[PDB]
């Protein structure tokens, strides 16, 4: 339960800074793109019997 | 003699198409040549020029 932190608004403000500092740094190392790995993977065998 | 016949008579050869590989201006037909291909019966095997 809260109530703690009301007597301690610095310790509470501190959490809210770290959580914000953590991610954000994350935003500058997290891979970007449209979709993640979505489609089932496939393997293809290629043969050739000329003629 | 028996063996090397079976090889020659029961082989499978290749040869080109008609057009395909760089053809001469305004060709109109393109098809695939079908040379020798494997004997498919005990019968055909009997007939081997030995």
Q: Quote the CA–CA distance of A41 and A29 in Å, as a whole number.
A: 26
Please name the residues between 9 and 38 in chain A that touch chain B, using a CB distance below 8 Å. none
Helix (H) or strand (E) holding A11: helix A9-25
Tell me if chain B has a CB within 8 Å of the CB of A51.
yes
A to B CB pairs, distance under 8 Å: 6
Rg (CA), chain A: 26
**Could you tell me which chain A residue has the CA closest to the CA of B36?**
A51
Tell me if chain A has a CB within 8 Å of the CB of B2.
no
Q: Quote the CA–CA distance of B33 and B19 in Å, as a whole number.
A: 11
Using alpha carbons only, give the angle B19, B20, B21 rounded to the nearest 5 degrees: 105
Q: Quote the CA–CA distance of B17 and A51 in Å, as a whole number.
A: 9
Using alpha carbons only, give the angle B10, B12, B18 rounded to the nearest 5 degrees: 145
Q: Quote the CA–CA distance of A5 and A11 in Å, as a whole number.
A: 7
- Give the resolution in Å: 3.3
Find the farthest-apart pair of alpha carbons in chain A and give their distance in angstroms, rounded: 86
Q: Quote the CA–CA distance of B46 and B50 in Å, as a whole number.
A: 10
Q: Say whether B15 and A51 touch across the interface (CB within 8 A).
A: yes
Among B12, B6, B30, B28, residue whose Cα is nearest residue B20: B30
Among B15, B45, B49, residue whose Cα is nearest residue B32: B15
Secondary structure (3-state) at B19: coil
């Amino acid at each position: 339960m809260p109530n703690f932190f009301i007597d301690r608004p610095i310790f509470a403000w501190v959490i809210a800074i770290i959580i914000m500092l953590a991610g954000g740094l994350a935003i500058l190392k997290l891979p970007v793109a449209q979709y993640p790995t979505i489609a089932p993977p496939a393997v293809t065998i290629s043969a050739s019997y000329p003629g | 003699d028996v063996i090397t016949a079976i090889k020659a008579q029961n082989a499978q050869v290749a040869a080109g198409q008609l057009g395909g590989t760089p053809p001469v201006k305004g060709q109109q037909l393109n098809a695939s040549i079908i040379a020798q291909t494997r004997l498919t019966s005990t019968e055909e095997f009997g007939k081997i020029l030995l």
